[PDB]
Each structure stands twice: as structure tokens, then as C-alpha cells.
Swiss-Prot record:
GO terms for molecular function: lysozyme activity. GO terms for biological process: cell wall macromolecule catabolic process; defense response to bacterium; peptidoglycan catabolic process; viral release from host cell by cytolysis. Induction: Expressed late in the viral replication. Changing T26E: Complete loss of activity at neutral pH; covalently bound substrate. It comes from Enterobacteria phage T4. This is Endolysin. It catalyses: Hydrolysis of (1->4)-beta-linkages between N-acetylmuramic acid and N-acetyl-D-glucosamine residues in a peptidoglycan and between N-acetyl-D-glucosamine residues in chitodextrins. Changing T26H: Facilitates transglycosylation more effectively than hydrolysis; covalently bound substrate. Its EC number is 3.2.1.17. The gene is E. Endolysin with lysozyme activity that degrades host peptidoglycans and participates with the holin and spanin proteins in the sequential events which lead to the programmed host cell lysis releasing the mature viral particles. Once the holin has permeabilized the host cell membrane, the endolysin can reach the periplasm and break down the peptidoglycan layer. InterPro entries: Endolysin_T4_type (IPR034690), Glyco_hydro_24 (IPR002196), Lysozyme-like_dom_sf (IPR023346), Lysozyme_dom_sf (IPR023347), Phage_lysozyme-like (IPR052619), T4-type_lysozyme (IPR001165). It comes from the Viruses.
Amino acid sequence: MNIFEMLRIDEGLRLKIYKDTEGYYTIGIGHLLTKSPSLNAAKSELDKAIGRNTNGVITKDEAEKLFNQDVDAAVRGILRNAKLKPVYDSLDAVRRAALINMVFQMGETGVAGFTNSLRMAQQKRWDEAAVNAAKSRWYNQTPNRAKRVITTFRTGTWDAYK
Ligand SMILES: [Cl-]
Ligand SMILES: [Cl-]
Ligand SMILES: [Xe]
Ligand SMILES: [Xe]
Ligand SMILES: [Xe]
């Protein structure tokens, strides 16, 4: 299992623009398009990402690309977020993926807001940090997802995804 396999599981796959759980225009594998309510903005934006007039629809390949770019940026973000770099680096490989999923889902920012857990996570306090993570708007809004992730983080295995 890996980062791509993992997020493919958590975000699914849609070839047509859709709204997330948040009500936001999205497509592909978790490719947020715009916080705006304008479906039009949203198609502009798809078109712009894609490089053509999609008319609101992309191919598998197209989704796979946005996805590739999206994971890449995530890792690159992490690695450049000075609060984030050092946690990430301290982690084993499973756990890294967990940090990247989270970042892919809520942004460097939002993630940067798990300071408290992020520090116990830094300090190898698996369970302690996992319980703190649960006390978050993030956990309450997408419990099931959130769970697979605080599990993977805490355990350092992929069990939650098997
Ligand atoms: Cl883009
Ligand atoms: Cl969920
Ligand atoms: Xe975290
Ligand atoms: Xe955790
Ligand atoms: Xe966490």
C-alpha cells in the first residue's frame, strides 16, 4: 500500500464535477476546484487546470494527472513548511503517508493547526496524540476517514486500510 493507493481509497474517483461533503466544487480524486458557488467559476477553473474546454468532464487519465500533481505538491508543501518538515522527517514511512493524506485533505495550514498532537506525534506518543487528533472539527465532520488516518499514524501500519 502507499500514498496513492491510500488517498484513492479516501477520496474516490469522479469524472464529472461534484461537490464535496463541504459543498465545494471538486473533480477527480479529491481535486478541489473552487470554494465559490458558481458552477461556472468551477468549469473555468476545470478548464484552466486541464488545458482545454472540458465542459465539466475529464478522463481517467486527466484525473490521474491532477492527482499526481496534487500528491507532489503536498509532499513539497510539507517539506517546506517549517513547522511540518521536522515532524515528517522524524517519522517512519507509514506515518509519513498519514501526514501527507491529512495535508492533502486539509492544507498545510489546517494541518499546521494540530500542533498539540503534532508535537506528541513528534515525541512518539502514539496513543496520546491520536486521542488529541480526535478532538477536532476534522474528526467530527469525517469520522470514518479521520479514523483510518489517526490509526495509520498511531500504529504505523496499514491495517485501517485492509
Ligand atoms: Cl491545476
Ligand atoms: Cl468519512
Ligand atoms: Xe497530527
Ligand atoms: Xe497519531
Ligand atoms: Xe495524529
